[PDB]
Amino acid sequence: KSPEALRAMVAGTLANFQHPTLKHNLTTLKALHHVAWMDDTLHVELVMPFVWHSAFEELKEQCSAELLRITGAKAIDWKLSHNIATLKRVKNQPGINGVKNIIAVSSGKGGVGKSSTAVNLALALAAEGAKVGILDADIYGPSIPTMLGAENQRPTSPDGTHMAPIMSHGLATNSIGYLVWRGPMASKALMQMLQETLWPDLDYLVLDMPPGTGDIQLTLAQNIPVTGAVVVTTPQDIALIDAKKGIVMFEKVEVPVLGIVENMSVHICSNCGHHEPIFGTGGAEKLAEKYHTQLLGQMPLHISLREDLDKGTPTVISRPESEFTAIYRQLADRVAAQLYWQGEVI
Amino acid sequence: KSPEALRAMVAGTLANFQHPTLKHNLTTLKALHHVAWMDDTLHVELVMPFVWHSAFEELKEQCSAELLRITGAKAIDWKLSHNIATLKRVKNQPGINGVKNIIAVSSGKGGVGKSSTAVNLALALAAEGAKVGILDADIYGPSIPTMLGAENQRPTSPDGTHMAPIMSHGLATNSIGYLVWRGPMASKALMQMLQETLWPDLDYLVLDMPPGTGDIQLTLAQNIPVTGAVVVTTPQDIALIDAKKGIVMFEKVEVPVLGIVENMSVHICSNCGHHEPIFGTGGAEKLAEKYHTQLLGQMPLHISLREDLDKGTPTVISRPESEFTAIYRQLADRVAAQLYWQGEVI
Numbered sequence: 001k002s003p004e005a006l007r008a009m010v011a012g013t014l015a016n017f018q019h020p021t022l023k024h025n026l027t028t029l030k031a032l033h034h035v036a037w038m039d040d041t042l043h044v045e046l047v048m049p050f051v052w053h054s055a056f057e058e059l060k061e062q063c064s065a066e067l068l069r070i071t072g073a074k075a076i077d078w079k080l081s082h083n084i085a086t087l088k089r090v091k092n093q094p095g096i097n098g099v100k101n102i103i104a105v106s107s108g109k110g111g112v113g114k115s116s117t118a119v120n121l122a123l124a125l126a127a128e129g130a131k132v133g134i135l136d137a138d139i140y141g142p143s144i145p146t147m148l149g150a151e152n153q154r155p156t157s158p159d160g161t162h163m164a165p166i167m168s169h170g171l172a173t174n175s176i177g178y179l180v181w182r183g184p185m186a187s188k189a190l191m192q193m194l195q196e197t198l199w200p201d202l203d204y205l206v207l208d209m210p211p212g213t214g215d216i217q218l219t220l221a222q223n224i225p226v227t228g229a230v231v232v233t234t235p236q237d238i239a240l241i242d243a244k245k246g247i248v249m250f251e252k253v254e255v256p257v258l259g260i261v262e263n264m265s266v267h268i269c270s271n272c273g274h275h276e277p278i279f280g281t282g283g284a285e286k287l288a289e290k291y292h293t294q295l296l297g298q299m300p301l302h303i304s305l306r307e308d309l310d311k312g313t314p315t316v317i318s319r320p321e322s323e324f325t326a327i328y329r330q331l332a333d334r335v336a337a338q339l340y341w342q343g344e345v346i
Numbered sequence: 347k348s349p350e351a352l353r354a355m356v357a358g359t360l361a362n363f364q365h366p367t368l369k370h371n372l373t374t375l376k377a378l379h380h381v382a383w384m385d386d387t388l389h390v391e392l393v394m395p396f397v398w399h400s401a402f403e404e405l406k407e408q409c410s411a412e413l414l415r416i417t418g419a420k421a422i423d424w425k426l427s428h429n430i431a432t433l434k435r436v437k438n439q440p441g442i443n444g445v446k447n448i449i450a451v452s453s454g455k456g457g458v459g460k461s462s463t464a465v466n467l468a469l470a471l472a473a474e475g476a477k478v479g480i481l482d483a484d485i486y487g488p489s490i491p492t493m494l495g496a497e498n499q500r501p502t503s504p505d506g507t508h509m510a511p512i513m514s515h516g517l518a519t520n521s522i523g524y525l526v527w528r529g530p531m532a533s534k535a536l537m538q539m540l541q542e543t544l545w546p547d548l549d550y551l552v553l554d555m556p557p558g559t560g561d562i563q564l565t566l567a568q569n570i571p572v573t574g575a576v577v578v579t580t581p582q583d584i585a586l587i588d589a590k591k592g593i594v595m596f597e598k599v600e601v602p603v604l605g606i607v608e609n610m611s612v613h614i615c616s617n618c619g620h621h622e623p624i625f626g627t628g629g630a631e632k633l634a635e636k637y638h639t640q641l642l643g644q645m646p647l648h649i650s651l652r653e654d655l656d657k658g659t660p661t662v663i664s665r666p667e668s669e670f671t672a673i674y675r676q677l678a679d680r681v682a683a684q685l686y687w688q689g690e691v692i
């Protein structure tokens with residue numbers, strides 16, 4: 001078991017593992033950090049530039065069979081780390097202090113679950129192994145502090161000018177609702193809240209944007225160093241048209257569109273367990289390839305998800321072992337990988 | 347059986363019939379047109395100032411028992427007529443030529459089924475016994491001609507300047523989509539389409555408005571002789587907030603708000619038959635009394651209703667004997683009665 005021959009065997013095995021989060025195989029990512037041989041057990045330490053906790057489990061169950069087969073180990077001791085990479089933005093627009101990446105979440109009008117996707121994406125990204133925050137920028141409907149229960153709280157001012165973020169459910173949070181308003185005036189107060197908030201070491205910062213593609217939304221996509229955008233829609237035709245507009249809006253500002261999330265794809269009868277595409281099917285998939293982007297994931301419509309939206313504890317935290325949390329965790333892996341595969345590391 | 351004693355007995359019986367469409371009993375409406383006695387059968391002819399076909403059936407089954415009891419008739423020969431009354435509008439804003447009343451249908455943003463309610467209200471109003479048309483004014487999403495199949499058709503110009511309406515499913519129809527656009531320019535072309543269209547003897551004219559409460563929507567509620575408005579919402583909180591805005595918008599223009607229609611109140615599993623309030627419950631009822639107006643009706647969310655919206659034949663025509671059509675027919679009676687009980691006849 002030569003340590004250089006061990007690395008060659010391990011890297012030669014990980015090079016075949018395929019996954020929706022892997023545009024190219026793992027050897028592309030230089031992730032193979034360490035390969036050792038202690039007490040007849042083969043140690044493999046992997047350091048990914050984006051979150052990969054759930055996908056890392058699939059790698060273990062698929063490759064350990066052959067990894068034990070070519071090596072001579074009683075077992076394999078895996079280990080997953082994360083050094084989240086800061087991706088370069090267009091025009092080198094100065095990024096936010098303490099914020100590596102900014103994943104924007106936008107939609108067209110309400111009723112699509114944009115804000116529901118924002119809180120759970122942020123919690124899933126943190127659950128997948130990153131330092132995550134979330135800025136509620138939805139001026140029309142500041143609903144993030146309510147979804148987290150931090151509605152009755154207010155941020156403190158350590159620097160007098162700067163604001164200390166509310167650490168809700170482990171996320172560094174702040175909201176425009178803590179200050180309540182249309183036109184360029186709303187964009188200014190929303191902007192400086194991003195600068196004046198003392199974000200910690202946020203590898204990711206989910207930005208719940210105001211819905212629509214007006215001048216105030218476009219002003220946000222211009223002056224905010226958005227690393228990537230995630231458009232949210234329902235299989236309804238009226239929502240897909242708005243998603244078509246949002247993708248166009250972000251493209252015309254050179255902000256990378258990570259993909260589309262199809263909320264309320266099907267409804268799950270709480271008694272029958274039957275899945276009913278009450279709003280259509282495949283409409284989001286059609287828009288994904290029509291604009292050369294991915295369909296990052298789908299999310300059903302279920303009564304338990306709406307109930308979690310009223311109790312002030314999002315589903316990723318309330319039901320950490322549910323299918324819905326497992327879907328949100330997959331979305332985080334799918335999103336953070338797409339944020340990486342599109343750009344270049346700094 | 348003195349004919350004056352017959353009328354007293356009939357009017358004294360109809361004076362007790364109670365119904366959600368009757369703010370005051372039938373004797374208020376002077377509707378008792380004729381009471382006769384031919385071949386031992388009692389004839390009763392009723393002429394209502396608003397549509398009442400479905401409610402007229404309830405009057406027959408409830409009152410014929412006692413009507414035969416106080417009279418001496420082998421049976422009762424009912425007869426329902428309609429002389430739809432033109433209600434006076436605020437500031438005496440000159441009404442549209444050939445259009446007695448204008449029932450506006452508005453909402454906040456899309457996904458609430460505003461346009462689905464508009465076509466079926468118009469068809470139900472006609473099914474309930476009136477001459478009805480419908481003008482698609484939704485500039486953002488002209489979806490009425492598609493819902494009727496008259497999408498590929500275009501109006502003809504009899505007077506060169508004036509337009510002949512497309513007689514789709516017996517309705518006098520016209521759409522802004524036949525011309526395709528924001529700002530005061532959109533309000534002008536939309537306005538003159540209402541004047542230049544040669545509406546026949548439209549007792550009612552459903553106006554499918556653009557969603558929202560912006561300046562262009564408010565300009566429409568000002569310059570159009572709207573006799574009444576019907577706000578559409580879903581039990582979602584985001585839609586109810588928009589309904590709260592629309593009611594306020596119409597009130598500040600002295601346009602009577604007829605009430606609220608709660609679309610997608612519950613979802614009906616096509617297998618379980620189970621009703622699931624996926625978007626909440628009672629939110630629309632709360633807004634109704636908070637603004638001193640009626641809850642004109644509720645409408646479930648079912649796959650067959652969405653399918654009727656793609657096949658180009660609305661549910662009132664496609665499934666004339668379904669529960670959903672029976673609900674739309676009740677809504678017409680509820681709406682047209684509310685349009686009457688609020689104002690004064692010309």
Ligand SMILES: [Mg+2]
Pocket residue numbers: 115138141142143144
């Ligand atoms: Mg919101």
Ligand SMILES: [Mg+2]
Pocket residue numbers: 461484487488489490
């Ligand atoms: Mg429409």
